[PDB]
Write an enzyme that holds these catalytic residues in place. Structure first.
Site, PDB file in Angstrom:
ATOM      1  CG  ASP A 114       0.912  -7.787   0.922  1.00 45.53           C
ATOM      2  OD1 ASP A 114       0.054  -8.426   1.441  1.00 45.53           O
ATOM      3  OD2 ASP A 114       1.100  -6.628   1.003  1.00 45.53           O
ATOM      4  CB  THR A 115       0.216 -11.137   4.576  1.00 46.26           C
ATOM      5  OG1 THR A 115      -0.243  -9.633   4.477  1.00 46.26           O
ATOM      6  CG2 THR A 115       0.159 -11.933   5.870  1.00 46.26           C
ATOM      7  N   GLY A 171      -3.595  -7.608  -0.323  1.00 46.47           N
ATOM      8  CA  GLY A 171      -4.788  -8.427  -0.406  1.00 46.47           C
ATOM      9  C   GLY A 171      -6.219  -7.804  -0.719  1.00 46.47           C
ATOM     10  CB  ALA A 216      -1.064  -0.005   1.252  1.00 46.27           C
ATOM     11  CB  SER A 217       3.297   2.642   1.912  1.00 44.32           C
ATOM     12  OG  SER A 217       4.460   1.405   2.180  1.00 44.32           O
ATOM     13  CB  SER A 218       6.774   1.655  -1.333  1.00 43.04           C
ATOM     14  OG  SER A 218       7.713   2.115  -2.193  1.00 43.04           O
ATOM     15  N   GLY A 219       5.641   0.286  -3.974  1.00 43.67           N
ATOM     16  CA  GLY A 219       6.104  -1.061  -4.829  1.00 43.67           C
ATOM     17  C   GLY A 219       7.635  -1.244  -5.134  1.00 43.67           C
TER      18      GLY A 219
HETATM   19  N1  LIG Z   1      14.459   3.219   8.119  1.00 46.30           N
HETATM   20  C1  LIG Z   1      13.442   3.042   8.884  1.00 46.30           C
HETATM   21  N2  LIG Z   1      13.303   2.726  10.130  1.00 46.30           N
HETATM   22  C2  LIG Z   1      12.168   2.357  10.846  1.00 46.30           C
HETATM   23  N3  LIG Z   1      11.052   2.125  10.200  1.00 46.30           N
HETATM   24  C3  LIG Z   1      11.039   2.280   9.031  1.00 46.30           C
HETATM   25  C4  LIG Z   1      12.252   2.611   8.222  1.00 46.30           C
HETATM   26  N4  LIG Z   1      11.887   2.578   6.833  1.00 46.30           N
HETATM   27  C5  LIG Z   1      10.654   2.124   6.784  1.00 46.30           C
HETATM   28  N5  LIG Z   1      10.244   2.157   7.813  1.00 46.30           N
HETATM   29  C6  LIG Z   1       8.610   1.468   8.048  1.00 46.30           C
HETATM   30  O1  LIG Z   1       8.575   0.719   7.309  1.00 46.30           O
HETATM   31  C7  LIG Z   1       6.784   0.890   6.754  1.00 46.30           C
HETATM   32  C8  LIG Z   1       7.003   0.294   5.448  1.00 46.30           C
HETATM   33  O2  LIG Z   1       6.974  -0.965   5.541  1.00 46.30           O
HETATM   34  P1  LIG Z   1       6.531  -2.030   4.187  1.00 46.30           P
HETATM   35  O3  LIG Z   1       6.726  -3.548   4.785  1.00 46.30           O
HETATM   36  O4  LIG Z   1       7.483  -1.560   3.166  1.00 46.30           O
HETATM   37  O5  LIG Z   1       5.008  -1.376   3.953  1.00 46.30           O
HETATM   38  P2  LIG Z   1       4.058  -2.044   2.882  1.00 46.30           P
HETATM   39  O6  LIG Z   1       2.759  -2.487   3.771  1.00 46.30           O
HETATM   40  O7  LIG Z   1       3.391  -0.601   2.447  1.00 46.30           O
HETATM   41  O8  LIG Z   1       4.424  -2.826   1.912  1.00 46.30           O
HETATM   42  C9  LIG Z   1       7.174   2.423   6.763  1.00 46.30           C
HETATM   43  O9  LIG Z   1       5.547   2.730   6.914  1.00 46.30           O
HETATM   44  C10 LIG Z   1       7.759   2.829   7.958  1.00 46.30           C
HETATM   45  O10 LIG Z   1       7.010   2.667   9.039  1.00 46.30           O
HETATM   46  C1  LIG Z   2      -5.731  -5.375   2.431  1.00 49.31           C
HETATM   47  C2  LIG Z   2      -4.458  -5.999   3.508  1.00 49.31           C
HETATM   48  O1  LIG Z   2      -3.302  -5.570   2.995  1.00 49.31           O
HETATM   49  C3  LIG Z   2      -2.361  -6.814   3.332  1.00 49.31           C
HETATM   50  O2  LIG Z   2      -2.357  -7.423   2.249  1.00 49.31           O
HETATM   51  C4  LIG Z   2      -1.095  -6.045   3.845  1.00 49.31           C
HETATM   52  O3  LIG Z   2      -0.439  -5.294   2.796  1.00 49.31           O
HETATM   53  C5  LIG Z   2      -3.243  -7.249   4.284  1.00 49.31           C
HETATM   54  O4  LIG Z   2      -2.831  -8.745   4.534  1.00 49.31           O
HETATM   55  C6  LIG Z   2      -4.638  -7.363   4.183  1.00 49.31           C
HETATM   56  O5  LIG Z   2      -5.494  -7.300   5.169  1.00 49.31           O
END
Ligand SMILES: Nc1ncnc2c1ncn2[C@@H]1O[C@H](COP(=O)(O)OP(=O)(O)O)[C@@H](O)[C@H]1O
Ligand SMILES: C[C@@H]1O[C@@](O)(CO)[C@H](O)[C@H]1O
Length: 479
Positions: A236-237, A82, A12-15
C-alpha cells in the site's frame, strides 16, 4: 476508449473497492467508491488476527457490484498493508491462523536475530529497517512455536498476492511488498538464503519476486468475461508513493494512515552506517525507485484513543484540539510500548508522567499529545533523511486519510519548517490504478502519472509559520 479500472486497497483500518475512469486524450482521471468496509484487528483464540474470509467476501461484493452495473472492466489490482502473509497447503487451503503484525508472538525474536546473525549483516543483506514484526521474525515465531503446521505448508503468499490468488487461482510474489519482509536481498531482488534459513521458512514456499505490471491471471464476472488481475505496486505504501505528486529530488512524502511513512525516492539504496544508526528502510518501489523512509507509529495512537473514549466525531475532536496550547505533552510515538498496548490512553499518560510532564486527560488533550508528538517526530525524521542523502527538501507531500487532518498538516509544516502539500486522500488507490493503466498501455511511467494526479486531485498548500507555538518550541530545542 476510456478505461474502467478497479483498485482494491486494504489498509489496517479499512478496505475499499474503487473504480477509476481514465482516458488518455482527455488526461481525465476520476475515482468513485464502490464498496468501503471495516478492517481491524480481531482477537481469535488468544491471537491477534485478520478476518481474511470477510475481506475476501467484501472484495467480491465490490467487484460484483461493478459487474452487475454492466461496466466493461478493463483490469483489477490489489494493494494491502505490508509484512503479513497467509500460509497455504498443497490444495490452497489456509494453514494456521492469519496472524496480524500487531501480535506479540514475535516478541524478543528481532533481538535474537541480531545476536545470532549480526545486526549489520541483516541490514547489509536487506537494507530494511528493524521492526520487531517484520516477516523475518514472524516466520521465526511460526516455525518455532507451531512446528506441527510446517509439513502442511506448500506456499506463503503476502496479503495482496493472497487475494489475487483467491480471485485468479494463480500465485504471485510481488516485488514492492516482498521487500517489506526483511527477507529479500537488496543486491539480487530475490529471497536471501541466509535470512530464510534463520526464519525456518523454505525457499520453495515462495517464488522469484516479480516487478509490478504483470498479469497474474484472470477473474470472471457472473457473466463469463475474462478480466486481467494485474500485479500492482502491491505494498500500500508503494502505491501511495506512486500517486504522490513529487516534484524532483527536493520532494519528500508522508504517507499518513494507520502508520505515518515519511521518506523520499532514490535510484540507489542507503545502507551505510548513517542509515543503519537511523534505522532507515530501503523499501522496493515501482521502476526500482527505492522508497527510503522510516516508519512512524502514526494515527494508530489516535484510532485507539477514539475507540477507548468512545469518540464518534473525529472532525469535531480535531477542531477542539486546535484550541489547546501546543507541546505541553510530548511522547515518543515510536516507542515499542505503543505498538499494541491493552490500554492506549493509560500508556500515553504513563509515558508523559515518566517524563515529568503534565498528564493529558481530556479527549482533546490526548489528541493534542498525539498530534504534537507526531509533528516533532516528523521534523526529526525529515532532518535525518536530508542529512542522510546530502540534500534538503523544498516540499513535503502528505497523502492518505491523515492528509484530511488540517491541524496536523499545519503542525507538520511548522515543525519541519517546510511547505506542505496535502493530497490526494486515496493515494494508495490511485497508485494501484496507475500501474494497471501502464499494463493497459494507457500510461507510460510513474512521472507521467504524477502529472495526471497533480492536474486532477485536490491539493492544499500549508505554508510554514515561523511564529507558531510548535515552531517556537522546535527553535528552542536546537540551541
Ligand atoms: N474527515 C477526516 N478528517 C481528518 N482525518 C481523517 C478524516 N477521515 C479519516 N481521517 C484519518 O485518516 C486515518 C485513516 O487513513 P487511511 O489512509 O485510510 O488509513 P489505513 O492506513 O488504515 O489505510 C484515520 O485513522 C483518521 O485519523
Ligand atoms: C505493516 C505496515 O503497514 C504499512 O503497509 C502501512 O499500511 C506500512 O508501510 C508497513 O510497515
Amino acid at each position: 476508449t476510456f478505461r474502467n479500472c478497479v483498485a482494491v486497497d486494504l489498509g489496517a483500518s479499512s478496505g475499499r473497492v474503487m473504480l477509476a475512469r481514465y482516458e488518455r486524450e482527455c488526461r481525465s482521471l476520476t475515482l468513485r467508491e464502490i464498496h468501503r468496509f471495516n478492517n481491524g484487528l480481531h482477537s481469535q483464540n488468544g491471537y491477534v488476527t485478520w478476518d481474511v474470509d470477510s475481506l475476501e467476501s467484501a472484495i467480491r461484493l465490490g467487484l460484483n457490484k461493478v459487474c452487475a452495473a454492466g461496466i466493461a472492466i478493463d483490469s483489477i489490482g490489489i494493494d494491502t498493508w505490508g509484512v503479513d502473509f497467509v500460509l497455504l497447503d498443497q490444495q490452497g487451503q489456509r494453514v494456521g491462523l492469519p496472524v496480524a503484525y500487531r501480535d506479540s508472538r514475535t516478541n524478543g525474536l528481532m533481538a535474537q536475530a541480531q545476536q545470532q546473525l549480526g545486526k549489520r549483516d541483516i541490514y547489509q543483506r536487506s537494507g530494511i529497517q528493524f521492526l520487531p514484526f517484520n516477516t523475518l521474525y514472524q516466520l521465526r515465531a511460526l516455525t518455532e512455536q507451531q512446528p506441527e503446521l510446517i509439513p502442511h505448508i506448500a506456499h506463503a503468499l503476502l496479503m495482496p498476492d493472497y487475494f489475487s490468488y483467491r480471485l485468479t487461482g494463480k500465485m504471485n510474489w510481488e516485488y514492492t511488498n516482498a521487500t517489506t519482509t526483511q527477507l529479500v536481498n537488496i543486491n539480487s531482488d530475490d529471497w536471501d538464503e541466509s535470512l530464510l534459513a534463520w526464519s525456518g521458512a523454505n525457499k520453495a514456499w515462495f517464488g522469484r519476486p516479480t516487478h509490478p505490471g504483470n498479469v497474474i491471471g484472470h477473474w470472471i464476472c457472473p457473466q463469463g468475461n475474462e478480466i486481467p488481475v494485474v500485479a500492482v505496486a502491491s505494498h500500500d505504501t508503494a502505491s501511495a508513493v506512486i500517486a504522490s505528486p513529487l516534484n524532483g529530488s527536493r520532494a519528500a512524502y508522508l504517507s499518513s494512515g494507520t502508520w505515518s511513512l515519511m521518506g523520499f525516492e532514490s535510484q540507489t539504496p542507503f545502507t551505510n552506517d548513517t542509515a543503519l544508526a537511523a534505522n532507515i528502510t530501503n523499501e522496493g518501489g515501482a521502476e526500482g525507485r527505492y522508497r527510503v523512509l522510516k516508519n512512524i507509529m502514526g494515527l494508530w495512537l489516535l484510532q485507539r484513543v477514539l475507540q477507548e473514549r468512545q469518540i464518534n466525531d473525529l472532525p469535531a475532536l480535531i477542531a477542539a484540539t486546535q484550541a489547546l496550547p501546543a507541546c505541553r505533552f510530548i511522547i515518543n510515538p515510536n516507542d515499542d510500548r505503543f505498538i499494541n498496548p491493552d490500554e492506549m490512553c493509560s500508556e500515553i499518560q504513563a509515558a508523559c508522567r515518566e517524563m515529568a510532564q503534565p498528564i493529558p486527560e481530556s479527549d482533546a488533550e490526548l489528541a493534542r499529545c498525539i498530534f504534537d508528538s507526531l509533528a516533532l517526530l516528523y521534523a526529526d525524521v525529515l532532518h535525518e533523511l536530508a542529512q542522510l542523502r546530502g540534500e534538503d527538501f523544498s516540499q513535503l507531500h502528505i497523502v492518505g486519510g491523515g492528509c484530511q487532518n488540517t491541524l496536523l498538516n499545519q503542525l507538520c509544516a511548522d515543525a519541519c519548517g517546510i511547505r506542505v502539500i496535502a493530497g490526494p486522500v486515496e493515494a494508495s488507490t490511485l497508485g494501484n490504478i496507475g500501474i494497471q493503466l501502464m499494463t493497459l498501455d494507457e500510461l507510460n511511467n510513474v512521472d507521467d502519472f504524477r502529472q495526471v494526479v497533480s492536474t486532477t486531485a485536490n491539493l492544499t498548500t500549508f505554508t510554514p509559520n515561523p511564529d507558531s507555538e510548535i515552531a517556537h518550541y522546535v527553535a528552542l530545542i536546537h540551541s
